[PDB]
Amino acid sequence: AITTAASRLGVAPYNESRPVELRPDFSLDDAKMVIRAVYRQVLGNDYIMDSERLKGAESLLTNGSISVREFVRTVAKSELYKKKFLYNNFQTRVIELNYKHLLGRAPFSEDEVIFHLDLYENQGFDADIDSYIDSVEYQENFGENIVPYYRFNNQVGDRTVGFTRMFRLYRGYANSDRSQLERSSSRLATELGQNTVSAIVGPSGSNAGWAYRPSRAGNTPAKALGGTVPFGQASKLFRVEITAISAPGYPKVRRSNKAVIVPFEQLNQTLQQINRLGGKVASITPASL
Amino acid sequence: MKTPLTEAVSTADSQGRFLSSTELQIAFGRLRQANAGLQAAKALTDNAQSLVNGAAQAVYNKFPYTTQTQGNNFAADQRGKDKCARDIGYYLRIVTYCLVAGGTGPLDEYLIAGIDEINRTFDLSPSWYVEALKYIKANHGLSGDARDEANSYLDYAINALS
Amino acid sequence: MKTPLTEAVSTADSQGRFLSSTELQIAFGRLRQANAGLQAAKALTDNAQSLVNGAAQAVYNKFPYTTQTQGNNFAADQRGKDKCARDIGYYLRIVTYCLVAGGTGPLDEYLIAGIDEINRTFDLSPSWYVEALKYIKANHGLSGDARDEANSYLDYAINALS
Amino acid sequence: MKTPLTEAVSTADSQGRFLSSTELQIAFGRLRQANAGLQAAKALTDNAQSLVNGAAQAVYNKFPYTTQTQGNNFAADQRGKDKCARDIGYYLRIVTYCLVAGGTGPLDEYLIAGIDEINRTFDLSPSWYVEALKYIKANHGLSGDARDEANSYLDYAINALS
Amino acid sequence: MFDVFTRVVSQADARGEYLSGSQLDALSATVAEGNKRIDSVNRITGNASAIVSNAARALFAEQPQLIQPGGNAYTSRRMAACLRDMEIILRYVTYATFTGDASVLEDRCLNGLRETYVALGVPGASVAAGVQKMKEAALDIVNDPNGITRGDCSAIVAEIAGYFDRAAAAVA
Amino acid sequence: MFDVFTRVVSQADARGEYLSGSQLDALSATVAEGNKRIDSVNRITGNASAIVSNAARALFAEQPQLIQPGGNAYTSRRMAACLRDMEIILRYVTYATFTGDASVLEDRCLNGLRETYVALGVPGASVAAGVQKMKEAALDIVNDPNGITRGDCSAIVAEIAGYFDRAAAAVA
Amino acid sequence: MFDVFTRVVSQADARGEYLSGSQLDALSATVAEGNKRIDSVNRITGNASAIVSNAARALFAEQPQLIQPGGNAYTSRRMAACLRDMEIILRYVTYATFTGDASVLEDRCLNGLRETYVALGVPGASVAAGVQKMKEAALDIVNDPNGITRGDCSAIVAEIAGYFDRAAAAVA
Amino acid sequence: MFDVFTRVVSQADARGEYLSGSQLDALSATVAEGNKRIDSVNRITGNASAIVSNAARALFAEQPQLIQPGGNAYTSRRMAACLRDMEIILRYVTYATFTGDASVLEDRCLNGLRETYVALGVPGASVAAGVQKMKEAALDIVNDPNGITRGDCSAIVAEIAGYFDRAAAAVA
Numbered sequence A: 001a002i003t004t005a006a007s008r009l010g011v012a013p014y015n016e017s018r019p020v021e022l023r024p025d026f027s028l029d030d031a032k033m034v035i036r037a038v039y040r041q042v043l044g045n046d047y048i049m050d051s052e053r054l055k056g057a058e059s060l061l062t063n064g065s066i067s068v069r070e071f072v073r074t075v076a077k078s079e080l081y082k083k084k085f086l087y088n089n090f091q092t093r094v095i096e097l098n099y100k101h102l103l104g105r106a107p108f109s110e111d112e113v114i115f116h117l118d119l120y121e122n123q124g125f126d127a128d129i130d131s132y133i134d135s136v137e138y139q140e141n142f143g144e145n146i147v148p149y150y151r152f153n154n155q156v157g158d159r160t161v162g163f164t165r166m167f168r169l170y171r172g173y174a175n176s177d178r179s180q181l182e183r184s185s186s187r188l189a190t191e192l193g194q195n196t197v198s199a200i201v202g203p204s205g206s207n208a209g210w211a212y213r214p215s216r217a218g219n220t221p222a223k224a225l226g227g228t229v230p231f232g233q234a235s236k237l238f239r240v241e242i243t244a245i246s247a248p249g250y251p252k253v254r255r256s257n258k259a260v261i262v263p264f265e266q267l268n269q270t271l272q273q274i275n276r277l278g279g280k281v282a283s284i285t286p287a288s289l
Numbered sequence B, C, D: 001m002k003t004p005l006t007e008a009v010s011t012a013d014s015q016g017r018f019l020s021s022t023e024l025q026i027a028f029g030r031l032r033q034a035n036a037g038l039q040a041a042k043a044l045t046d047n048a049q050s051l052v053n054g055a056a057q058a059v060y061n062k063f064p065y066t067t068q069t070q071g072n073n074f075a076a077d078q079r080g081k082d083k084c085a086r087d088i089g090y091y092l093r094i095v096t097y098c099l100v101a102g103g104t105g106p107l108d109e110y111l112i113a114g115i116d117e118i119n120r121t122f123d124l125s126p127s128w129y130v131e132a133l134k135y136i137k138a139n140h141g142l143s144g145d146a147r148d149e150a151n152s153y154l155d156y157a158i159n160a161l162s
Numbered sequence E, F, G, H: 001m002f003d004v005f006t007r008v009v010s011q012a013d014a015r016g017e018y019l020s021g022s023q024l025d026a027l028s029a030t031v032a033e034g035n036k037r038i039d040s041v042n043r044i045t046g047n048a049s050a051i052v053s054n055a056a057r058a059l060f061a062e063q064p065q066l067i068q069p070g071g072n073a074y075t076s077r078r079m080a081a082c083l084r085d086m087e088i089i090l091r092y093v094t095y096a097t098f099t100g101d102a103s104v105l106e107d108r109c110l111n112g113l114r115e116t117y118v119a120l121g122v123p124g125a126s127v128a129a130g131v132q133k134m135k136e137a138a139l140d141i142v143n144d145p146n147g148i149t150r151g152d153c154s155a156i157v158a159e160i161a162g163y164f165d166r167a168a169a170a171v172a
């Protein structure tokens, strides 16, 4: 599980929550809890205005005319969901969001993008939505009666890349999919295409370097090809991600975000220099063997 | 936001389809309506001051305690009277946007969504705004399609408030 | 069925909304079109046998092997010729439905959805029906909005087949 | 890429399981087949030019309008004849991959996925390729397991096209 | 769901025939009524809140047992649900008016409503009474001769009455 | 998403002002071009498959490296994705033409496309070439004087060419 | 994922070539080693629990900081997670052995594992030490000369060692 | 970085081809526009200070939160940085206009700028509004008919407008 780093990763509140199940012969308070959970999960913790509520679908859920899964399906196909997540997004962004909302995880591979992009293009948004909800994965985790929830913890069938990518899509508890630094941009287009991963940067409030994001071009690669040779005598190399660089000012400072590969023997100097740049350490990761 | 042109593309986009005769018809429906809307928006704009002030006074007349009672939510002082005229101005201006756009989109996004919480939080009676909206309906002097479309938006706001 | 009226209501219902100016403008668009659509439908219906026989002969001319090669999928015997004329008639009749309905709804529901599986399963060439559809476009003698709407549906089928 | 070995691991992985006697037997099945598959691939590869040329001619004889009709999609000129021999070469090559892989994986990934779009978009008859594949089945000279595995892949392609 | 046009189409398709000249002319006559239909939908929609509230007020005044403690419309949640249902039914009636066919109302709103109400204990006859009150108010609003081009709307008004009656029977 | 009208409304609301007379006149001028706009959308749509297939055929002939074994458009899967992309771009170009605003093209299609192609090794320059071929083909179609009320579409044609050029630039 | 056969195929298709005679001959040599490969998988699997538990015990003995209070393997939740991970890594190493291609191990297990452990504060160097211990036990089990048809498994044993090395290098 | 000429050369070397006749004639048409391009660069440059300061004045008048105490553009250092940034963006737009290719703007200016602003807390949507105002002023200056040889600069104006559009989109 996630224990020590749960709070700084924004996972602790989900560790403290149980799946929201609608039992047969449910009470009205049960129905209200499901409705609240579905709105929070499926709409990415956006505030929902009374004018935006799906009152008819809520009635049918309350009446047992539709199960939880069918209520999720209705919310996912609503003009409200599409306005929030479809009409203004690159389809790869849409697929990312669908996975997060409806399956509680991030896409694992480029194959998932191929499948859902073609399905949308050939059969339309509704058909694509059904594929998530009628999937084996949805059935195994949530079935007919449980609201979808974030699957942070390792499960059978997982891949490691899923874990790192969840923190590209989930940015903390007091946050929504439409209020994140990358805004409308696909978070995973490049990761999926290259099958690469990124160092995990936890949410703001609990991580000073929370804003670190790489640029389109001119990034430092993850691993130290060439080893310590360019640095001279050095025992081991680390990749440091740095954000919020301002102090020297333009043109001495061009990009406020920077990743550097530095040797063990210069980490003291590196931290000192970073502090004087005003920057905040986003992540440190071994870069050599 | 809800307009004929945006709904048409939103429908076709959701289906992953090129636009078809259905959407072309939607556009013709817009084109048949647009000039009357633009004409109505111009008339309301040129008359906005009289309308806003007339509507504000109509509310004070119908609910005289709003200009006699002390309170942050009332218009018994110049502060509250300015808020109220400001508010009515928002309704009138955003209604002209609907006439330009050809749908309720502007009202939906800028005014209606969340209006219930605001009126509750600051203790503002929806009835006050209904009376003002009724005044604008009675006094904008529009005719024909300009009138019908304009009154649909004014009633749309009235219904949302009630 | 994708028609302007049903789509308008379905989108409104998705939002739990009464119909508004947007949907009324969809209706005016439909009304502007409908008389032309109905006139087109009558004209195609009155000329249906001429159009269907001409289209079948046009396919046989462009693809002579269809009337010369033995096989269930070809029209070398009267059995195959009858299937072919029936199929072309289906296309024409359903296109008239699209003109009456004011959208591709009937084509989508009755013909287009699943046509690929049929043409693949029974080894029918979509180019055959493209040719027939081109014949009909070039010989219905429609003008104006009737021509425009009829050809949009004929092109919708052609595009689907290619 | 469906093959016995990757399917074995895929199923075990999705169940979170170590490989068991079930998957080991799958491996023994692959091993029983592998040498016959490799022999078949060799034989087809060595005889590829004759097979590809003969298959192309088989198509031309069955569908003589392909070598007589003008158009980007037909083989009336050397350009179209080169495309056609190329396509038949692709089918044969990828089939050899299947024999190497011991499954339809390579056909699924490199040829079958998307073939219906291509054939529709460029107006190519899948019947042309069926006849080419039938020629290859009739003439590759394989026997025993080599023949059966290879014919299964040729048939798999044929079934996909029909 | 069907509209007035596709209703005819579907009947013709199942018979494999083109629409007759008589059917096409019947649709043409429907097109000639389109403006009246649009006005009727607009007028009901413009007055929806008033139609619902006044009908609900009148309903409870005639049936106080609904709003006495223990009554089916007693407590805020149940009163709120009751008011919601009245608006849903009105909304779907306007949908049917807009399309010119009852299928939207029947297929989405009424189908299975009686069973829901019977299972809940909602008094169907009282819902039907409410629907009738909304109907009368709606028809008067539609027929109001002021501020609109004058003409005969008896055909459209009769169609709307039929839709309201369908809703009343479906639950009554 | 914005259409021609909501774009102006959104800007005006952010400033808290009514639309000025000039702005209402510009929109009136846009309305007067509506029929031409609709015709252009209809004409492009009616030839969608030909526009895409011909452009693609021409691109591969010019750029045979794309379809040689191992080339980016080799294998049915990738060829299918390539054809699909061309159709997607054409589709959103018609949406933008229909709405009179590029936002739908930018938001749905172009925002993130360069990152996708760069990440996958898709030769964006070659995509831009294909888009240009669809552009030339589409503008020829939109300009065909035959079978339509004669008039001046140069303004609409320029706007459409702008959308194609925008698409081409976004991927190159 | 790839296996030994489909790895060569994918490289061949990327160049549009039939497999060469030597490529086919090399794959035949692979087939000839198939039984030894199967035996190696069976032996690791049959001892999986012992391999994991013995390695965990040795690791915790050599690095007692891991299990002292506050250590990353302290508490039942974390110790269970630690034991699970060791089993997961072993499982995927066997998958790679079975298929003869590291892709299943790299794609599904190792890719992102370094970042994951850094994010969680799991000591990656210690994980690597655990993997090395499993490696030694597993190779000894694979090489056990008793109860099996005698022959030379040095090539298979080297391949399996390579997979364990990939795992060790990835976690740290 | 690319200019209009070397952009085309790059795409030709990638295919191992001499520039086609039409490509050479396209570049000649570009040369024929050279003077208009120089004039536009010169007019924007000559008015740079006013373009920036007027745009900034309009921005802070429409978005007064920026310059209230606690606003991102409050304090002299932040106001100075803000004014500097607008000038930087305008400068690179003139670079792109001068070369006839967006590469300099995209590579040297917009790369990582969105990321810089979010990391520092700079409101990018407000930066984009500033760029818009600079765009409006810049095009009017470029289109000014006074004191210059008369001709059609519509194509250069469209290109310049495009570069501003890129900038506005990139900063947020």
Ligand SMILES: *[C@@H](C)[C@H]1/C(=C/c2[nH]c(/C=C3N=C(/C=C4\NC(=O)C(CC)=C4C)C(C)=C\3CCC(=O)O)c(CCC(=O)O)c2C)NC(=O)[C@@H]1C
Pocket (backbone or CB within 6 Å): B021, B024, B025, C033, C036, C144, C145, C146, C148, C149, C152, F035, F036, F037, F038, F039, F040, F042, F142, F143, F144, F145, F146, F148, F149, F150, F151, F152, F153, F156
């Ligand atoms: C440039 C695109 C070409 C061009 C366009 C053009 N169109 C019109 C006028 C009309 N076009 C239509 C279109 C339709 N009617 C339908 O029923 C449908 C099918 C759903 C369509 C697409 C209509 C209704 C009109 C108005 C009536 C008429 O037919 O004239 C014009 C005239 C200007 C105007 O609209 O005021 C023009 C110029 N004309 C060319 O020459 C270009 C090649």
Ligand SMILES: *[C@@H](C)[C@H]1/C(=C/c2[nH]c(/C=C3N=C(/C=C4\NC(=O)C(CC)=C4C)C(C)=C\3CCC(=O)O)c(CCC(=O)O)c2C)NC(=O)[C@@H]1C
Pocket (backbone or CB within 6 Å): D021, D024, D025, G032, G033, G034, G035, G036, G037, G038, G039, G040, G042, G142, G143, G144, G145, G146, G148, G149, G150, G151, G152, G153, G156
């Ligand atoms: C290194 C791995 C050790 C080794 C292996 C080895 N095995 C064989 C031969 C066989 N092993 C099997 C295995 C199985 N048969 C079954 O039914 C099952 C259960 C599903 C298993 C796991 C088989 C079928 C054979 C072939 C028949 C036989 O029993 O010999 C060999 C011999 C050479 C060959 O490749 O066939 C070898 C070398 N031998 C050692 O000495 C290493 C310690």
Ligand SMILES: *[C@@H](C)[C@H]1/C(=C/c2[nH]c(/C=C3N=C(/C=C4\NC(=O)C(CC)=C4C)C(C)=C\3CCC(=O)O)c(CCC(=O)O)c2C)NC(=O)[C@@H]1C
Pocket (backbone or CB within 6 Å): H032, H033, H034, H035, H036, H037, H038, H039, H040, H042, H142, H143, H144, H145, H146, H148, H149, H150, H151, H152, H153, H156
């Ligand atoms: C749109 C940009 C406006 C416009 C431009 C325009 N300019 C010319 C021609 C010329 N402009 C120059 C410029 C300069 N000469 C210098 O010595 C310098 C200072 C270093 C500059 C900036 C020159 C040399 C020419 C050519 C000779 C001439 O004076 O005409 C044209 C004519 C077309 C052409 O040159 O090909 C045009 C159209 N004209 C407008 O109306 C726009 C407002």
Ligand SMILES: *[C@H](C)[C@H]1/C(=C/c2[nH]c(/C=C3N=C(/C=C4\NC(=O)C(CC)=C4C)C(C)=C\3CCC(=O)O)c(CCC(=O)O)c2C)NC(=O)[C@@H]1C
Pocket (backbone or CB within 6 Å): A045, A046, A047, A048, A173, A174, A175, A176, A179
């Ligand atoms: C009010 C004093 C200021 C202000 C606020 C403002 N906030 C938002 C949007 C959001 N606020 C939150 C915060 C939370 N969501 C949670 O679930 C929690 C508890 C765990 C918190 C603290 C979120 C997530 C959002 C985004 C979601 C959404 O639906 O908006 C807005 C809306 C902004 C916009 O609509 O563009 C506003 C206006 N704004 C001010 O000007 C005040 C200073």
Ligand SMILES: *[C@H](C)[C@H]1/C(=C/c2[nH]c(/C=C3N=C(/C=C4\NC(=O)C(CC)=C4C)C(C)=C\3CCC(=O)O)c(CCC(=O)O)c2C)NC(=O)[C@@H]1C
Pocket (backbone or CB within 6 Å): A245, A246, A247, A248, A249, A250, A253, A254, A255, A256, H066, H071, H072, H073, H077, H078, H079, H081, H082, H083, H085, H086, H088, H089, H108, H109, H110, H113, H116, H120, H122, H123, H126, H127, H130
């Ligand atoms: C003005 C319209 C808005 C605004 C601006 C603002 N920017 C900064 C700080 C920086 N801006 C940059 C920009 C660039 N670096 C580059 O290399 C280029 C491209 C060549 C650009 C445009 C950088 C690097 C910084 C940081 C270093 C520096 O401050 O010089 C600030 C100050 C941030 C601070 O926290 O002090 C401001 C205020 N702010 C607004 O509110 C306007 C919308």
Ligand SMILES: *[C@H](C)[C@H]1/C(=C/c2[nH]c(/C=C3N=C(/C=C4\NC(=O)C(CC)=C4C)C(C)=C\3CCC(=O)O)c(CCC(=O)O)c2C)NC(=O)[C@@H]1C
Pocket (backbone or CB within 6 Å): B033, B144, B145, B146, B148, B149, B152, C021, C024, C025, E032, E033, E034, E035, E036, E038, E039, E040, E042, E142, E143, E144, E145, E146, E148, E149, E150, E151, E152, E153, E156
């Ligand atoms: C029927 C119950 C009542 C009635 C209706 C009626 N209406 C018309 C004509 C029109 N009504 C409209 C409606 C609108 N125009 C708009 O722009 C909008 C807002 C989006 C609406 C709702 C229109 C366009 C017309 C046609 C033009 C005109 O100026 O009239 C008629 C006349 C016949 C006809 O169908 O055209 C009638 C009869 N009239 C009554 O007396 C009833 C009380």
Ligand SMILES: *[C@H](C)[C@H]1/C(=C/c2[nH]c(/C=C3N=C(/C=C4\NC(=O)C(CC)=C4C)C(C)=C\3CCC(=O)O)c(CCC(=O)O)c2C)NC(=O)[C@@H]1C
Pocket (backbone or CB within 6 Å): D059, D060, D063, D066, D067, D072, D073, D074, D075, D076, D079, D080, D081, D083, D084, D085, D087, D088, D090, D091, D110, D111, D118, D122, D124, D128, D129, D132, F057, F060, F067, F073, F074, F075, F076, F079
């Ligand atoms: C031969 C039986 C008949 C024939 C062939 C023909 N094919 C094309 C064009 C294409 N063929 C393909 C097929 C493939 N591409 C792949 O990547 C694979 C999988 C590995 C296959 C099977 C494709 C994609 C095309 C179009 C793109 C391209 O040019 O490569 C043509 C030309 C079609 C055109 O419009 O240019 C022809 C002529 N034609 C006959 O008449 C033969 C009977």
Ligand SMILES: *[C@H](C)[C@H]1/C(=C/c2[nH]c(/C=C3N=C(/C=C4\NC(=O)C(CC)=C4C)C(C)=C\3CCC(=O)O)c(CCC(=O)O)c2C)NC(=O)[C@@H]1C
Pocket (backbone or CB within 6 Å): E057, E060, E067, E073, E074, E075, E076, E079
């Ligand atoms: C008293 C402070 C002021 C007042 C009261 C008033 N109320 C109504 C009507 C209703 N009141 C309720 C309230 C409830 N019903 C419930 O079941 C519960 C929860 C247990 C509550 C709180 C309701 C539902 C109604 C409407 C239906 C009904 O008539 O019962 C009226 C009449 C309103 C009308 O339009 O008929 C009045 C007068 N009015 C004042 O002016 C007082 C200051």
Ligand SMILES: *[C@H](C)[C@H]1/C(=C/c2[nH]c(/C=C3N=C(/C=C4\NC(=O)C(CC)=C4C)C(C)=C\3CCC(=O)O)c(CCC(=O)O)c2C)NC(=O)[C@@H]1C
Pocket (backbone or CB within 6 Å): A055, A056, A057, A058, A059, A060, A062, A063, E066, E071, E072, E073, E077, E078, E079, E081, E082, E083, E085, E086, E088, E089, E108, E109, E113, E116, E120, E122, E123, E126, E127, E130
């Ligand atoms: C009001 C005139 C009468 C009344 C109504 C009443 N209805 C319910 C409960 C429900 N009503 C519905 C109906 C619908 N839901 C939909 O989505 C649609 C459109 C397809 C319809 C028609 C449903 C489903 C319910 C049950 C679930 C829910 O609570 O929403 C109640 C509450 C019953 C209860 O005990 O909870 C009431 C009070 N009751 C009267 O007494 C009036 C005659």
Ligand SMILES: *[C@H](C)[C@H]1/C(=C/c2[nH]c(/C=C3N=C(/C=C4\NC(=O)C(CC)=C4C)C(C)=C\3CCC(=O)O)c(CCC(=O)O)c2C)NC(=O)[C@@H]1C
Pocket (backbone or CB within 6 Å): A090, A091, A092, A113, A114, A117, F066, F071, F072, F073, F078, F079, F081, F082, F083, F085, F086, F088, F089, F108, F109, F110, F113, F116, F120, F122, F123, F126, F127, F130
């Ligand atoms: C065709 C002219 C060129 C070409 C295209 C090509 N594209 C891909 C793959 C993808 N294309 C997209 C595109 C989109 N996703 C969206 O959301 C939208 C907007 C709605 C678009 C346009 C995506 C996301 C992918 C990745 C998924 C997929 O593969 O379908 C490929 C395949 C690349 C690969 O390695 O598989 C190809 C071939 N390639 C050329 O060579 C032409 C110049």
Ligand SMILES: *[C@H](C)[C@H]1/C(=C/c2[nH]c(/C=C3N=C(/C=C4\NC(=O)C(CC)=C4C)C(C)=C\3CCC(=O)O)c(CCC(=O)O)c2C)NC(=O)[C@@H]1C
Pocket (backbone or CB within 6 Å): G057, G060, G067, G073, G074, G075, G076, G079
């Ligand atoms: C005492 C009743 C009997 C006994 C104990 C014994 N335990 C172990 C090994 C372990 N004990 C634990 C237990 C915990 N670790 C924790 O973090 C916590 C939660 C706070 C608990 C309860 C664990 C995890 C181990 C294994 C790892 C470790 O050594 O720490 C042993 C040794 C087992 C081995 O194989 O090394 C023994 C001997 N044994 C008896 O015979 C007593 C009756």
Ligand SMILES: *[C@H](C)[C@H]1/C(=C/c2[nH]c(/C=C3N=C(/C=C4\NC(=O)C(CC)=C4C)C(C)=C\3CCC(=O)O)c(CCC(=O)O)c2C)NC(=O)[C@@H]1C
Pocket (backbone or CB within 6 Å): A001, A002, A003, A004, A005, A006, A152, A153, A154, A155, A158, A159, A160, A163, G066, G071, G072, G073, G077, G078, G079, G081, G082, G083, G085, G086, G088, G089, G108, G109, G113, G116, G120, G122, G123, G126, G127, G130
């Ligand atoms: C044991 C030798 C060491 C150790 C391990 C340890 N790991 C975790 C937590 C996780 N481990 C993983 C790993 C994977 N997830 C996957 O999907 C894959 C392949 C399928 C792998 C390898 C993950 C994702 C987690 C977090 C999620 C979860 O555990 O469900 C922990 C617990 C972390 C915590 O409690 O915060 C531990 C203890 N720790 C040591 O000290 C040993 C050296």
Ligand SMILES: *[C@H](C)[C@H]1/C(=C/c2[nH]c(/C=C3N=C(/C=C4\NC(=O)C(CC)=C4C)C(C)=C\3CCC(=O)O)c(CCC(=O)O)c2C)NC(=O)[C@@H]1C
Pocket (backbone or CB within 6 Å): H057, H060, H067, H073, H074, H075, H076, H079
């Ligand atoms: C008063 C002595 C004379 C005067 C003043 C005047 N100032 C401005 C505009 C600005 N003043 C400032 C100054 C500051 N901003 C800060 O954040 C701080 C540090 C905390 C200071 C000192 C700035 C930045 C501006 C420009 C931006 C803004 O409007 O806030 C004006 C208006 C200038 C304009 O063009 O709008 C004026 C009039 N003018 C006189 O004539 C007085 C003698």
